Amino acid sequence: SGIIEFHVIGNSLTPKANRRVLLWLVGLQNVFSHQLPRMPKEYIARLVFDPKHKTLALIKDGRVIGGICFRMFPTQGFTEIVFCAVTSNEQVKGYGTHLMNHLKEYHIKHNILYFLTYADEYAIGYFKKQGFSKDIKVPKSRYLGYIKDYEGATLMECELNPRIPYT
Ligand SMILES: CCCC(=O)SCCNC(=O)CCNC(=O)[C@H](O)C(C)(C)COP(=O)(O)OP(=O)(O)OC[C@H]1O[C@@H](n2cnc3c(N)ncnc32)[C@H](O)[C@@H]1OP(=O)(O)O
């Protein structure tokens, strides 16, 4: 096609059955590893290939140029943002925002209207631009022991509005 494409992919059972998806998952694992260099690569690989986790992939000419790895908790009423990266050469063009907006549209469709994520300090502003806040409204009992945590990171929340804003 020669245009960007959004694919929501993952490992449903085993990743070997669809080699195109497998190659994209490896690409995602490598993008996440390169852009989240303090994350252990084995941790990234495990979660990207975990069947409870999906990744919204941004593909350009067969190559993964970014993605958001997430876990949906429909009963909890929230989705956990696990990894969020754009490949370095493709950064600062609007893709990181483009990815998050898409992810929001997907979730509105699935009637999940809250994102929770941990953020390292130097990424907080990206999440703030995407409407995330450090003020958590999801009760602690809804996410404690559901979401993964990290030493020193800041928990942030985005409240989605399904209502289309028109001025
Ligand atoms: C483990 C917990 C979950 C996580 O992944 S936390 C770590 C999140 N990801 C990373 O740190 C990976 C490394 N960085 C990246 O991959 C990219 O910088 C990132 C965050 C995906 C953004 O991708 P881009 O394609 O550059 O996004 P974009 O072109 O839509 O521009 C982003 C808009 O937000 C703004 N922003 C504010 N504080 C920022 C900050 N600290 N880092 C990045 N952007 C920031 C930025 O100025 C831009 O807005 P505007 O275009 O100026 O209006």
* Structural domain spans, the chain: 1-167
The stretches of the chain forming alpha helices (DSSP H) are 19-35, 41-48, 95-109, 124-129, 140-143
Annotated binding site: 84-86, 91-97, 122
Residue 70, exposed/middle/buried by CB under 10 A (0-12, 13-18, 19+)?
Answer: buried
In short, whether 111's Cβ falls inside 6 Å of ligand 1 is no
Residue 66, exposed/middle/buried by CB under 10 A (0-12, 13-18, 19+)?
Answer: buried
Method underlying the structure? X-ray
Give the list of residues 6+ apart from residue 31 with CB closer than 8 angstroms, or none.
Answer: 64, 65, 66, 67, 85, 86, 87
Domain 1-167 CATH class label: alpha beta
Selecting among 5, 80, 105, 151, the annotated active-site residue is 80
**Which ligand 1 atom lies nearest to the CA of residue 87?**
16
In short, whether 3's Cβ falls inside 6 Å of ligand 1 is no
Resolution, given in Å to one decimal, reads 2.1
Annotated binding site for succinyl-CoA: 84-86, 91-97, 122
Place of tokens 């929501």: 8
Q: In what order do the strands lie in the sheet with 114-119?
A: 5-10, 54-60, 63-73, 78-86, 114-119, 154-159, 132-133
Tell me how far apart the alpha carbons of residues 101 and 107 are, in angstroms, rounded to a whole number: 10
Closest to 85 (Cα-Cα) out of 131, 114, 48, 113: 48
CB 71 within 8 A of CB 25: no
Hey, whose CA ends up nearest to atom 38 of ligand 1? Answer: 125
Residue 10 vs residues 49, 125, 134, 138: alpha-carbon distances, Å = 6, 28, 29, 26
